[PDB]
């Protein structure tokens, strides 16, 4: 089927089913119209089968089982004799579909097919013994015919056939032809056989009865009419499966991948005549790894070649809130383009099935690309597909330096003389969700037989709180080493023109009613989105003590620091009294302009909004990795607990407790690196917060963006904002 | 059980049953009298059962089975007639018990319950066939029953019941009513009626017999009171269940979690009537994801709803050893401390039952703490436990800044022209036990079977070897970078007092039996705590080997060159003729309390002591992980190797092998991040072992506890310790 859109106010609302649009199998694929900008889904591909290739020009004959197995007379057990058989059909179902045979028995991968035609070369095994002697023969078993007389091998293939004659092989005095071995020095050889007759003794001297500790090896076989089926002779027939080294029509195609069928393979690949080597003559097959692409011919033996049509599919997009689905494939790489116009033909519907098709194929290093071509010279790149070609409009196709050029060397100079100063943002995590589960609530919940199958796989599973819980401890103790590394927690003035320019909003204020600091406000309106034992545990520093922390910082003779901050890029006191109006006018000219970056979407916090998303993908996996199973008898065990027995649901729950605990497993460990990962983004910024102690340059990043003079720290939720200045000179220059 | 104190001077020594106290529970988790300082450990809570809720104020009837299966009459198999029953007591367990049913069969589903009172829509199919026609009645059967004439669903759930009538259905002549299809244009549908007579061609002409490739679909049913009971008619009964869309009373509560009772559920969770839609008429059950909580009453089709009762809990403590047990717990997460006072009003023991009880309940934003409750002002903050909450005395309940002020903007400065200069420490982890875990020897030891059934699930096994292996080249690879950078390993000085103070304690001496640096021995006493493949390799670098490389650096005009050193911080050459007799005292007096900063217990060796209780905890559950199985036979398999045979074995040990194979491949995974981590923090380290050139600051961490003007290195079991200096000037200012 496929899902839809519950309104809670109780409405069957408008909801979307995918494959009328390849547009909607992105819709399909996550959630509805909510959409990137414009980027991509990863999904599946595949090539549609069609047509068929066998084997055999070559053979005319069946064989006659009628004679051996309506035959008159079987070999002994202690001397087996084997019956070749070549050039037969294996229609084993016809003697399958009779009462000829009591006991029908097959071992290891013979009791797989037994309908199902395939080729070997059949050896056939045959004797008489009596009653219960018939499940002494199998891999593993006890007594004189299997330890002294006859033996499979532990690892064998084939067929055991087998029924009885009392109206034949029983006499009312007694068939007392074939023997059976009783003593003799050691085990036996799987399919070993035994004609010599010499007397024995326990000491391995050969001698003659009647003696002491000297007897002979073989007695007869009672087999009586008047007597119950235990000592009842009964025929058994062994088959044997070694291998060639259900009619048909070979036909070479060529033209293909997408069915093939030779006994041993079932080729989904295409067909190549073509090279190279025929020697072996173990021929043909053999890969690394396995992966069987040298075949003969069954008539001209030719080296035929295959390799598959197995390939992948992803689709770019723009936003399709605010462009009009102007929407591209990209697959992911199956080169031949002319094999994707193959798949396009018209052409059976490889494979993501939908009503929309095009005829701008343009082909690219990374596969082909649907849906639009376009050389261009513009448009500096936006979506990246790999090789080089992004997507802007939709078009593209190329890629950007970019680029300008400079005057060579002479004997000048770069003097210039007016200059800028900027303002500049970055934004760093510091904290996920500070989570946490509880193993056996995730565990079937309530259950206590879930518990009492719980208490001996080894009780770690307070590890998978334990474990989990040391990012807990690790996750709040990177929030106080990035902040509490003050001397002491000054308060805030009352003066907000301090000076220079001012600390309009961001300046923690009186009234104000919030914190502090209006622009941790414009930050905090950023974000998007108990029964399963599944919780966030709340951090330990709240906002308003964050933003306590952020507070005293702003603070840092105010006109005199900043001044003496400069002398260290490299001016003099004469920046003192040139300025002063105009690094207000360029201060309160750019502090505004943040003010109007954001919000315009703001456009950068994609840093932050991934880091909530980088949970809210992951507990939202596990909650539907919950209630789909596997085992599969349904996907919650509140009904199959009062369902089964204590007989029967212990095969079930522990098939259903790994499925769940693995994933579970795969959780926590999932989870880990991200805590490895933001802790080392944590240490940066770590560092980085003390430039924020004027606190000049590194150099000559942070940020990079000029030189450095000072910087402003800010709060944000699980993040923190900084706002680096800079000087730039302009130009003018000037200079020789 | 519980767990003891063997002293093993071989004595039952003293042990602690827990659940006499809470405080109990903590040392029942993980270890005796050893005590945190004072911090946690997360265990589990419940919530304990009462009460029952069922449904059904409705129905009055049961139904005549009677009427059915002591009928005279059953239909075709080709032409099968249904019968429905509605309004009826599924009291099938009482048809169950008799002799009635010779062939007893359920599906799916169906052959769960048995003997269990559920409720449905029952369906009857009823038909006559022959003696092995019964099996033939399954997914996936053959025979022209189950192709041509009747066949059930491949998912199906139903009970299928039948017996022998050799008194009524079989006549001496043959009961020729009933008839068989073997001649049809394909398979079946699941529940095919088939009522029509078509004769056949298999062209698909239709014609008329007697002709050539023109012949009937149907034969008759030879029902022989004189033959075997392979051809004698059975009488079969299939039933069928379909959903609603064994007494009671229903009685809500609205009070509860803690159970509930309809069909379809086993409600576990609170009531409230309550909310909110109706609509559809699919009513009701509909959760993110199957949590079903939409409920209709029986009678009044009441929106009941649920939500659990499903919390944790941790305990808080002060180190038990030096204070006297004041324990208090948060219960985690079950915010109404009212339902918490509901499960302590006496109240049935939900769920950590023991003899304590407490009166002091504080609801917090964390769940709720019991044990104190002290709003109050002071106490900066010990143990947190989130929601800005600590734990200092108990007491606690607040947080702190904490916290200053300043005065504003002047037209004056700060001169501070008195300074001093303190020595500050920090450890840095270097390496981990550098381990090794031999693959087959954990899994199963010594045992060629095991092994046996270990050469084929694809031998990566080595690759816990290799992957394991790659750690320890390059842990070692890690204490070279850190510390061999010298360029000539430098001998030690014979004048202890280097023109400025001294070097006593840090300095490599003669005799000094030991090494070097008195110190580092005063770091080296500073530690706590090969049957099963399990070692521990030693490192490349031994210790005296790395007290070589720290005895060198201490070298680096030593009067002069730590004025140059200041000069680089902001002085000049008069601060060299002013300071060094009081230098060596604002020296010697600070490297002296350094030597009374530990022992101290030291007090900031945590670092170090948690790297080796990351592995010691880790090994420690990777052994008690051996024996807890599940295989559920035994935990050791030295018994069941020398118990079973093998024939049931590989049923067992297959699965006691998953068991400890995933155990084991959790652990390099979770060996491999702190690898990861471990290594981070030595770039770290080996960037900071440079600073340790002289070597200036960074700016202007390193220590960060001011300046830098130079540092001194250590040496420290799995770790390094630096001693870091710098100016600091402490007022007056006296400034205008």
């Known amino acids: 089927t ?10 069957i609302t408008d909801a979307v089913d995918c494959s009328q649009n390849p547009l909607a199998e992105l819709k399909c694929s996550v959630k509805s119209f909510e959409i990137d900008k414009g980027i991509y889904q990863t999904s599946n591909f595949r090539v549609v089968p069609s047509g068929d290739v066998v084997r055999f020009p070559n053979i005319t004959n069946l064989c006659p089982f009628g004679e051996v197995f309506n035959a008159t007379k079987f070999p002994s057990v202690y001397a087996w004799e084997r019956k070749k058989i070549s050039n037969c059909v294996a229609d084993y179902s016809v003697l399958y579909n009779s009462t000829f045979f009591s006991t029908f028995k097959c071992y290891g991968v013979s009791a797989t097919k037994l309908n199902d035609l395939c080729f070997s070369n059949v050896y056939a095994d045959s004797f008489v013994v009596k009653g219960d002697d018939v499940r002494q023969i199998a891999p593993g078993q006890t007594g004189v015919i299997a330890d002294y007389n006859y033996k499979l091998p532990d690892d064998f293939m084939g067929c055991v056939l087998a029924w009885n004659t009392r109206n034949i092989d029983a006499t009312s005095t007694g068939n007392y032809n074939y023997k059976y071995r009783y003593l003799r020095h050691g085990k036996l050889r799987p399919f070993e056989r035994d004609i010599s007759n010499v007397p024995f003794s326990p000491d391995g001297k050969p001698c003659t009865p009647p003696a002491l500790n000297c007897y002979w090896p073989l007695n007869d076989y009672g087999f009586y009419t008047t007597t119950g089926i235990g000592y009842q002779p009964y025929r058994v027939v062994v088959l044997s499966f070694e291998l060639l080294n259900p009619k048909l029509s070979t036909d070479l195609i060529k033209n293909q991948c997408v069915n093939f069928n030779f006994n041993g393979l ?22 690394v790894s396995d992966f069987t692409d040298s075949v003969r011919d069954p008539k001209t033996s030719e080296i035929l070649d295959i390799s598959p049509c197995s390939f992948g599919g992803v689709s770019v997009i723009t936003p399709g809130t605010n462009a009009s689905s102007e929407v591209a494939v990209l697959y992911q790489d199956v080169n031949c383009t002319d094999v994707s116009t ?50 802007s409009y939709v078009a593209y196709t190329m890629s950007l330096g970019a680029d300008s050029s400079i005057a060579y060397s002479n004997n000048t100079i770069a003097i210039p003389t007016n200059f800028s100063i900027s303002i500049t943002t970055e934004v760093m995590p510091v904290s996920m969700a500070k989570t946490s589960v509880d193993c056996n609530m995730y565990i079937c919940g309530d259950s206590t037989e879930c518990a009492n199958l719980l208490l001996q796989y080894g ?22 080493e990035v902040f509490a590394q003050v001397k002491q927690m000054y308060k805030t003035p009352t003066l907000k023109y301090f000076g220079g320019f001012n600390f309009s909003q961001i300046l923690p204020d009186p009234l104000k009613p919030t914190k502090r600091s209006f622009i941790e406000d414009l930050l905090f309106n950023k974000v998007t989105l108990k029964f399963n034992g599944l919780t966030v545990l709340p951090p330990l520093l709240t906002d308003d003590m964050i933003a306590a922390y952020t507070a005293a910082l702003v603070s840092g ?62 507990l939202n996996t596990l909650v539907k990795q919950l209630s789909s199973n596997f085992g599969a008898i349904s996907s ?24 769940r605990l693995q ?61 680096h200045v800079t000087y730039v000179p302009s130009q003018e220059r000037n200079f020789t």
């Open 663 to 723: 994933s579970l497993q795969t959780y926590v460990t999932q989870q880990l690196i991200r805590a490895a990962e933001i802790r080392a983004s944590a240490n940066l910024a770590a560092t980085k917060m003390s430039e924020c102690v004027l606190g000049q340059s590194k150099r000559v990043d942070f940020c990079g963006k000029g030189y450095h003079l000072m910087s402003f720290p800010q709060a944000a939720p699980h993040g923190v904002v900084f706002l």
């Open 266 to 287: 079932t080729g989904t690949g295409v067909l190549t005549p073509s090279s190279k080597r025929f020697q072996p003559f173990q021929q043909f097959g053999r890969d």
């Open 459 to 480: 009780s770690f599973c307070t590890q998978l709180n334990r474990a989990l819980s040391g990012i807990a401890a690790e996750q709040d103790r990177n929030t106080r």
């Open 342 to 391: 193959a798949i396009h033909a018209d052409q059976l519907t490889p494979a993501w099935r939908i009503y929309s098709t095009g005829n701008n194929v343009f082909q690219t290093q990374a596969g082909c690309l649907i849906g639009a071509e376009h050389v261009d010279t513009s448009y500096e790149c936006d979506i990246p597909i790999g090789a080089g070609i992004c997507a």
């Open 2 to 11: 496929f899902m839809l859109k519950y309104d809670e106010n109780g409405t």
């Open 557 to 618: 003779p105010f006109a005199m620091q900043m001044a003496y901050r400069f002398n260290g890029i490299g001016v003099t006191q004469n920046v003192l009294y040139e300025n002063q109006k105009q690094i207000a006018n360029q201060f309160n000219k750019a502090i505004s302009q943040i003010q109007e970056s954001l919000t315009t979407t703001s456009t950068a916090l994609g840093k932050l909004q991934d880091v909530v998303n980088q949970n809210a993908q992951a």
């Open 636 to 659: 919650v065990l509140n009904d199959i607990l009062s369902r089964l027995d204590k007989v029967e649901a212990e095969v079930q729950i522990d098939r259903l407790i790994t499925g």
